[PDB]
């Protein structure tokens, strides 16, 4: 098989970068800061312009002291180390990373179309074919990532950027990890967490396939299969054994979903002896041309409106905030490898 051969080459390519990561490939002063696209408890993501090229990037800025307070050091090193090493059309491209006294920076190629989350919430729900177009891309991406021993662990529409050709780029690798065995960290997003994570068992890449079922459900339904006002109530739902489908869900869609949202690991699609092929060969996917999807030759259900290079209207507005860089190095030994 050519898929295997693809994936073997992919792996050589990745391991070379994994084992010898790029470090320190730009400096903050090389970029003009334009606008905040998002904020979080340890950093923010801004639109910037690289002066030397005039290219636009999304620069993620992480406050090292906040990373340390939140016990996210290893996770942050995972994120940069994996991102600099992967290469797949549906993955955001990390063009540069560096650090200074205060902060870590990861500069990704700018995806102006915004997150799937925005377009899904506004439009309400996607048609089955529209959902399937997106789901195919996640299927290929996870097959790629998992072959490299990587677990992604934060699948949700919020992390799926829509590019100028209407294709996805996955962003936000802060919980991705290269692991051959099982792993135990409780992380992810409530609605997307597999039962074995909630129940504190060791788990593996099957959690990504359970999250795929959550995603497809949410894309085709317009709401997730398990929701409540509080996370504890969401967890009781997830572990309960019970999912209801809208009556508009095709019977094939419902059957994929029952196999993806399977509480039982020896039964979960993507986790069986035939692996990802159980999913790619499922009937819900019978019209999908996997190679044309990879090649981006399929016409997209939707192309975001682009007013021009540097537009941010597909992102929400955020209070701006100075970037102050300390005169003293913070946490140097913690982030030495970044």
């Amino acid at each position: 098989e050519s898929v295997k051969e693809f994936l073997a080459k992919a792996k050589e390519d990745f391991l070379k970068k994994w084992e010898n990561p790029a470090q320190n490939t730009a400096h903050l002063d090389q970029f003009e800061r334009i606008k905040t696209l998002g904020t979080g408890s340890f950093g923010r993501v801004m639109l910037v312009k690289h002066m030397e090229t005039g290219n636009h990037y999304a620069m993620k800025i992480l406050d090292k002291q906040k990373v340390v307070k939140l016990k996210q050091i290893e996770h942050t090193l995972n994120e940069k180390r994996i991102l600099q090493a992967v290469n797949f059309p549906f993955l955001v491209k990390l063009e540069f990373s560096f650090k200074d006294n205060s902060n870590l920076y990861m500069v990704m190629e700018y995806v102006p179309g915004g997150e799937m989350f925005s377009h899904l919430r506004r439009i309400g729900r996607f048609s089955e074919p529209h959902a399937r177009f997106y789901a195919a891309q996640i299927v290929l991406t996870f097959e790629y990532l998992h072959s490299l021993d990587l677990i992604y662990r934060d699948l949700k529409p919020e992390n799926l950027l829509i590019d100028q050709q209407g294709y996805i780029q996955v962003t936000d690798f802060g919980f991705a990890k290269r692991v051959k065995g099982r792993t135990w960290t409780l992380c992810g997003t409530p609605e997307y967490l597999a039962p074995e994570i909630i129940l504190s068992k060791g788990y593996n890449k099957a959690v990504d396939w359970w999250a795929l079922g959550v995603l497809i459900y949410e894309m085709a339904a317009g709401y997730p299969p398990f929701f409540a006002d509080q996370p504890i109530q969401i967890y009781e739902k997830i572990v309960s054994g019970k999912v209801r489908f809208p009556s508009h869900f095709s019977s094939d869609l419902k059957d994929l979903l029952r196999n993806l949202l399977q509480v039982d690991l020896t039964k979960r699609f993507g986790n069986l002896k035939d692996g990802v092929n159980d999913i790619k060969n499922h009937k819900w996917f019978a019209t999908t041309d996997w190679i044309a999807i990879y090649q981006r030759k399929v016409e997209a259900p939707f192309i975001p409106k682009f007013k021009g290079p540097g537009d941010t209207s597909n992102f929400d507005d955020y209070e701006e905030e100075e970037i102050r860089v300390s005169i003293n190095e913070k946490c140097g030994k913690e982030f030495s490898e970044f």
């Binding site: 016990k71 996210q72 949700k156 919020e158 409780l186 992380c187 997003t189 317009g222 709401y223 006002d229």
Partner: peptide, 20 residues
């Protein structure tokens, strides 16, 4: 409807990761 119960819930905006 489930759609109405969703839209009226406190989880229709961007959802935060958890950890720990």
């Amino acid at each position: 409807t489930t759609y109405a119960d969703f839209i009226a819930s406190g989880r229709t905006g961007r959802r935060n990761a958890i950890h720990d």
